[PDB]
Every structure is written in structure tokens, then in C-alpha cells.
Sequence to fold (321 residues):
Amino acid sequence: XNNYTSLIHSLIEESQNQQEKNEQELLEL
Amino acid sequence: XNNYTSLIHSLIEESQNQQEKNEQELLEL
Amino acid sequence: XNNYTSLIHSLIEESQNQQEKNEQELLEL
Amino acid sequence: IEDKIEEILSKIYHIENEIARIKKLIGEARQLLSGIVQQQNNLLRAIEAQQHLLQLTVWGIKQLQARILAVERYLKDQ
Amino acid sequence: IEDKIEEILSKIYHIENEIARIKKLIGEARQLLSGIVQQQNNLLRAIEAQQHLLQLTVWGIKQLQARILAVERYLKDQ
Amino acid sequence: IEDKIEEILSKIYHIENEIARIKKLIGEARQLLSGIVQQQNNLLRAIEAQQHLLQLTVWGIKQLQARILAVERYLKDQ
Fold:
């Protein structure tokens, strides 16, 4: 076969803030 | 269940030009 | 339908060393 | 003092020139860095779309398992 | 020599100032570059987790194929 | 004018030194940026391969659905 699916929502959530952050900083350049 | 599959061809197509572009610029460095 | 699955282990393996390397260099910054 | 403050001028000339290109390479390496951050999002978005379509196959496969086992039980009953 | 070595001073002032901000923009573009490398890993990890869940659907679908074909044969036998 | 154009020399020395390392850090942060762009492609390629294998499970699951429903109809007919 929570195993891989709950690990992904995690990665993607976590991979959403960073992408949200990286762009912020990129602007403040 | 065009829904997610036609959205992916889109993302990947779109995610192909950029990768194609980013490398160009990287060279012109 | 080794076809796509053996191509992925490849990409991911290959995509592991680079990520392992990129961070090294990033530190030596 | 004469050609002395001349050597100074030379270093400063070369210098301003060095500080010139660096102010350009950082230009180049800033649109790239920029584009690198927009693709990361595409890839991320692609990864989300994919998972959405993956959370569905797993679903379809779960009902199949049921569909098939009910057929199998039935045939064991007669 | 008087206001001569004055022009020098000016260029040097502006210069140190230019070398100032560049030493800051490279600061900014270094935590970003940094964060860009930590997300690449997340995405990579996500891609691995996904494949793990994908290597499983393919598995489940492979046994279904068997489950169904055995039911179909049986019914062709009577 | 004596130790006056001396202070100039000092600033210029330090300066050339500052412009030295920056010309090196930009070296380091350029192979990295480089490697960052080659991995983005791998990840992208991985994402394509995956989708290819995903477009197939969905296919296999679609025929299963058919395989199973035909078996189910049949058994309802007798």
C-alpha cells in the first residue's frame, strides 16, 4: 500500500511555502 | 477522473521551454 | 507497459547525486 | 607624485571596468535565477496535478478490487 | 595635483559604495540560491514518494488482471 | 599630498582585494547555478517518465473496468 500519500501532501505543502518564499526574496533583489 | 491529464501535458510542455531557455542564458554567462 | 520504471530509478538515482553535490558546493560558498 | 598618482589612476580605471562587467554578469545571473524560480513552480504544479491523477487510479483500483471480489464470492456460492 | 587627486578620491568613494551594495545583493542572491537548493530536494523527495505509490498501483493492477482472467477462464469452462 | 595619496593607495589595495574574492564567489555561485539548471532537467525528465507510466495505469484500469463489467453483466443474464 497513512503511508506514501500522507507523506506527499506533506512534501507538497512544504514544497509550497518554499516556492512561495523563494519568489518573495527573488523580488527583494 | 480533459481534466488532469491535459493540464499536465500543458505544465510539462511549458516546463520544457523554460528548461530549454534557462540553459541558454546560463551559457551566455 | 525494463521500460519506464527502470528509466525512473535511473533519473532519480542520477537526481540524487546532483542534489547531494549542489548542496556541498552551496556550503562552500 | 607625478607619474605616481598616475599608477593610481590606472588601477582605478581597470577597477571601474571590472566593477562594470560584474554589474552586468549579476544582471544575467539574476534573470536566470529568476527563471529558475518560475520553473520550480511549474514542476511543483506538475507534481501536484500528477498526484491528483494518482490519487484517482488508487481509488479506481480500490473499487475494482471490490468489484472483482464480489464476483468471486458469488461464484463460490454457486 | 590639488583637485587632481580629488577626482581620484571621488571615484574611490563612489567605488567603495558600488562595492558595498554588490556585497549585499550577493548576500540576498545567496540565501535565495540556498533556498532554491533546499526546494529542489523536496521536489525530488516528492517525486520519489510518488513513484513509490506508482510502483504499487501498477502492482495492484497486475494482480487484478490475474484475478479477472481467472474468473473469465472459469466461466468459459462452465 | 605625501601620506595623503597614501590613504588613496590603501583604499585601492583593499579594494582590488575585495574585487578579488567577489570574482571568485561569483565563480563558485556559477557552477552551482549551473548544476541547479542541470538537475531541474533531470527532475523534469523524471516527471515526464512518471506521467508516461501513469498514463498507462489509467489505461490498464480503464480496460479492467470493462473486463469486470462484462463478467458482471453476463452473470446477471445467467
About this structure: Chains C and A do not touch (no CB pair under 8 Å). The two ends of chain C are 45 Å apart (CA to CA). Chain C has one helix and no strands. Residues 17 and 23 of chain C are 10 Å apart (CA to CA).
